[PDB]
């Protein structure tokens, strides 16, 4: 809320899409997602470890969390209850090929 | 000696109380400190770890230049890496970015 109303959020992010992507997230992990996205957006300026002094008014006067930051953040926070849909997703890793029509019929059934 | 980097781009100064018993809760303006620094010492050569005694409104402080960045005239961006080595030296200018940090004692507010 404050992020948006202080003109600190890009115009690209679509919250409906994000709400659709986070399937089994509970209430206490969306906060982690926001924190991780903010950390990603912040790390592009300070460059902690490689070299300091890059913090200057120009870089910090246009901070804006984009959509790519959230997608990157989706690789750090992981559900704790949605741990069995991943296994189902790994069982069809070889991919589906419709070598015939009986396959389509059974799927339709 | 330097060839091109003859001016001071960014200078970091650690500020400490010379006398521990003279600690004052007065609010020190960093802009005034920089203005006094430029006003009293102009076109001087300074190197990292060099010490100075500053008299500001009757208060005596020990200043240690923790790091220095040397830049050449005409460099729009400070792409030069900030050097902590005593080899680097520069000439003070009325535009050098002066960053003040707490001294190792950590008493100056």
Resolution of this structure in Å? 3.8
Residue A52, SS3? coil
Give the angle subtended at the CA of B26 by the CAs of B53 and B58, to the nearest 5°.
40
DSSP string, chain A: -HHHHTT-B-S---HHHHHHH-SS--TTTHHHHHHHHHHHHHHHHH-TTT-S----HHHHTS--B-HHHHHHHTTT---SS--SHHHHHHHTTT-----SSHHHHHHH-
B70, B71, B82, B96, best to mutate vs chain A, most A CBs in 10 Å: B82
Quote the minimal CA–CA distance from B82 to chain A in Å. 8
Quote the minimal CA–CA distance from A60 to chain B in Å. 16
User: What method was applied to determine this entry?
Assistant: cryo-EM
Residues on chain B touching A53 (C-beta within 8 angstroms): 10, 69, 82
Residues on chain B touching A51 (C-beta within 8 angstroms): 81-82
Residue B100, SS3? strand
- Please answer whether residues B109 and B27 qualify as being in contact, where contact means their C-beta atoms are separated by less than 8 angstroms: yes
- Please answer whether residues B94 and B6 qualify as being in contact, where contact means their C-beta atoms are separated by less than 8 angstroms: no
Cβ of A107: how many Cβ atoms within 10 Å? 9
């Amino acid at each position: 809320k404050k992020m948006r109303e202080n003109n600190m959020m890009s115009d690209d992010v679509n919250l409906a899409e994000l709400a659709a992507l986070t399937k089994n997230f509970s209430g206490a992990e969306i906060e982690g997602l926001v924190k991780s996205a903010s950390s990603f957006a912040i790390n592009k300026t300070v460059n902690i470890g490689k070299g300091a002094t890059k913090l200057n008014t120009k870089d910090i006067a246009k901070l804006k969390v984009t959509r790519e930051d959230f997608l990157n953040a989706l690789n750090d926070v992981t559900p704790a209850f949605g741990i069995s849909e991943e296994d189902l997703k790994t069982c069809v890793e070889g991919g589906m090929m419709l070598y015939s029509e009986r396959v389509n019929s059974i799927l339709k059934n | 000696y330097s060839g091109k980097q003859s001016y001071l781009g960014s200078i970091d100064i650690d500020i400490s109380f010379r006398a521990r018993g003279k600690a004052v809760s007065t609010v020190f303006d960093q802009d005034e400190l920089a203005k006094q620094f430029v006003r009293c010492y102009e076109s001087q050569i300074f190197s990292p770890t060099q010490y100075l005694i500053m008299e500001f409104q009757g208060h005596f402080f020990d200043l240690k230049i923790r790091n220095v960045q040397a830049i050449d005239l005409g460099d729009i961006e400070p792409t030069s890496a900030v050097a902590t080595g005593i080899e680097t030296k520069g000439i003070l200018t009325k535009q050098t970015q002066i960053n003040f940090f707490k001294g190792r004692d950590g008493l100056v507010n």
